[PDB]
Paper text:
The M1 state has Lnt in complex with its GPL substrate. We, therefore, resorted to in surfo crystallization in the presence of added E. coli GPLs that include PE, PG, and cardiolipin (CL). Because PE and PG are substrates, we used the inactive variant, Cys387Ala, to capture a representation of the M1 state (M1A). The corresponding structure was obtained at a resolution of 2.4 Å. The ester at the sn-1 acyl chain of PE was positioned in the binding pocket next to Cys387Ala for reaction. The largest differences show up in arm 3, which, in the apo form, is partly disordered and, in M1, is stably folded over the PE molecule. The PE is bound with its glyceryl phosphoethanolamine headgroup in front of the catalytic triad and its acyl chains extending along the hydrophobic groove that acts as a conduit between the membrane and the active site. The chains adopt a somewhat unexpected orientation being tilted at an angle of ~45° with respect to the membrane plane. Our interpretation is that this tilting is a necessary part of a productive substrate engagement with the enzyme, which positions the sn-1 ester bond next to Cys387 for reaction. The ethanolamine is less extensively coordinated with just one hydrogen bond to Pro361 in arm 3.
Lnt is a 57-kDa protein that is present in diderm bacteria. It converts a diacylated BLP (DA-BLP) to a triacylated BLP (TA-BLP) using glycerophospholipids (GPLs) as acyl donors. The reaction is proposed to proceed by a ping-pong mechanism at catalytic triad residues Glu267, Lys335, and Cys387 (Escherichia coli numbering). Lnt is composed of two equally sized domains, a membrane domain (MD) and a nitrilase-like domain (ND).
Author numbering: 1 to 508
Write the structure that this text describes.
Amino acid sequence: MAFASLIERQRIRLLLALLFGACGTLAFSPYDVWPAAIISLMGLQALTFNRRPLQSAAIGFCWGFGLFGSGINWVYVSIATFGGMPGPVNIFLVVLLAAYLSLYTGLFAGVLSRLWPKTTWLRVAIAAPALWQVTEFLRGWVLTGFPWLQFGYSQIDGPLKGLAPIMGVEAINFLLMMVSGLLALALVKRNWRPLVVAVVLFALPFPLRYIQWFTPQPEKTIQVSMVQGDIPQSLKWDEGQLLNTLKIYYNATAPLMGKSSLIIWPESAITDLEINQQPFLKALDGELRDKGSSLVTGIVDARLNKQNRYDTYNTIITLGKGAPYSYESADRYNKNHLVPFGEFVPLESILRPLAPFFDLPMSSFSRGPYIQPPLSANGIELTAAIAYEIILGEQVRDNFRPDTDYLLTISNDAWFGKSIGPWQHFQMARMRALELARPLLRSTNNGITAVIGPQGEIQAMIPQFTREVLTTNVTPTTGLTPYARTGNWPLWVLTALFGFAAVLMSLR
Ligand SMILES: CCCCCCCC/C=C\CCCCCCCC(=O)O[C@H](COC(=O)CCCCCCCCCCCCCCC)COP(=O)(O)OCCN
Ligand SMILES: CCCCCCCC/C=C\CCCCCCCC(=O)O[C@H](COC(=O)CCCCCCCCCCCCCCC)COP(=O)(O)OCCN
Ligand SMILES: CCCCCCCC/C=C\CCCCCCCC(=O)O[C@H](COC(=O)CCCCCCCCCCCCCCC)COP(=O)(O)OCCN
Ligand SMILES: CCCCCCCCCCCCO[C@@H]1O[C@H](CO)[C@@H](O[C@H]2O[C@H](CO)[C@@H](O)[C@H](O)[C@H]2O)[C@H](O)[C@H]1O
Ligand SMILES: CCCCCCCCCCCCO[C@@H]1O[C@H](CO)[C@@H](O[C@H]2O[C@H](CO)[C@@H](O)[C@H](O)[C@H]2O)[C@H](O)[C@H]1O
Ligand SMILES: [Cl-]
Ligand SMILES: [Cl-]
Ligand SMILES: [Cl-]
């Protein structure tokens, strides 16, 4: 009686919401405690029972602030080291970002309480997943979006991993929210109905992990090299850094020519405008072709548009065998989804002169097309996403092609130091290779450089913060997974009919 009465105090539920929210962060890399996601969601769903609507929104806000406050605070690293702002505003922006993200999880908990106030089996297993889908969709969409920390990504090695190739990661977000809601109902009402339903709903997708939607092509097996140039962020875009960077990347590549069919350099590895590097690129391209090797590398490219102005792109270019270099070549990719404040500054005229954080080197990029053809090298088809774009599962899936041999992502994660950010980023990358049943080549500056197999497994990786090259054999795969054929409109029809059924019963 006294114990139950203590838990139903509102100031206590808030404190418990921080702890239960923060606990979610342990589900993602580098911690990888996948049950922490179920614990964290049970907290969010149980802690909101039997509360007023605006009371429940306060609890849902604090849960997110525990989650995002402990999970994405690594943004502080990049803001502190390169932001050039005083201490208090630096942490104010980090708490500001974590508070903004928490609106979407507070909005979720408010709506769920007004429309479904009774702690029923319908509000936890039907209304909650659908409304979560909507609010999480809204979080990853408004103001360019930021869909970081979705619990489905923690199931990359867990029992739900067979579900991603069929409906994508957001279906795992859906099921985890649902199974966690039945467990939460099973405790508060001390009923075994929801427990047995939750354990079967959770266990049913386990045999899925054994379906191989893909077929490996061992005849196409190559040696690939990815050079981790380890250029320090503070010097990377300094003009005096360029010759050293070119020497590092070139010296690592020349001895592998004739041995590695494909060589990859990371995001904007060549830190100069493509048009200023034509003697280098031409000489390099001829050298690659004589030996039978192809190179894909990041670079910056300012290109003249229709209205006689320059659009500067964050771009990948290709060179060498089966991909002869030209400034007029179409074998290239321009980053489409730009990172806010790092690659473009909203309200540019107001914010640019405030602090170096709002005027970072090369923070004036344009956006390439949403859909772009694969890169082509040696006869290999590479679906490309640059850095952050690899976490956008639908966008990656929409650029995917049936004749894609590998997924390719190149990234520069040095902004985030030795924090957990690079590992969270790396983990989400792995979900794309599982969803689409292709290997993924990840070339980074110092971030996690690795080759990911067609089921999300780590085939190879080199350690962070070192100047080395990962050279390994990799094998393409062919074949279409259900999620490749569809994207996530099926999950959206489930979200719609659950959300419809749920809103119906609540209109009584
Ligand atoms: C009953 C108990 C309830 C208590 C509720 C608590 C819930 C949990 C609370 C917090 C969880 C999250 C805490 C992490 C927050 C910050 C972590 C931290 O400080 O370590 C950060 C560094 O942490 C690290 O990255 C350590 C190294 C980890 C990488 C090496 C191991 C990798 C493991 C592989 C992971 C999976 C990859 C794929 C393999 C399957 C600090 O970084 P910094 O550059 O020095 O500056 C950071 C300034 N912000
Ligand atoms: C409404 C409330 C919002 C709060 C406003 C302030 C808080 C924003 C805090 C952080 C925003 C971004 C922090 C700096 C990140 C810089 C990374 C970057 O852009 O670099 C590039 C990074 O590109 C990548 O995709 C690699 C990894 C990026 C992962 C993204 C993680 C940070 C995203 C946080 C932004 C949050 C969105 C805002 C909410 C809608 C590459 O480096 P470079 O080519 O050598 O040169 C960079 C070009 N100048
Ligand atoms: C208000 C109570 C809500 C309870 C639950 C019912 C909510 C409605 C449920 C389902 C809406 C039906 C939408 C399915 C249509 C599918 C179309 C389609 O394939 O496009 C999909 C995306 O298009 C959409 O689904 C649009 C988003 C639908 C939002 C509908 C919710 C209304 C928004 C305001 C509601 C605010 C809370 C309610 C306030 C009382 C697939 O593309 P993607 O990969 O998700 O894009 C990612 C880019 N960031
Ligand atoms: C205090 C901070 C604000 C609190 C609440 C925030 C509400 C802000 C108003 C909601 C509308 C914001 O305006 C937002 O701008 C960007 C424009 O890039 C749009 O998003 C835009 O880029 C995305 C990329 O994912 C495209 O998919 C989208 O089609 C496009 O319109 C958002 O769809 C739009 O909603
Ligand atoms: C409640 C019962 C509902 C049963 C669903 C039966 C379909 C009717 C509802 C959808 C209407 C048309 O159905 C449509 O089919 C195509 C073929 O996969 C889907 O997919 C199509 O559009 C998407 C973009 O959204 C493309 O990325 C995709 O390449 C294309 O094939 C559409 O997203 C879906 O909207
Ligand atoms: Cl009190
Ligand atoms: Cl019930
Ligand atoms: Cl050729």
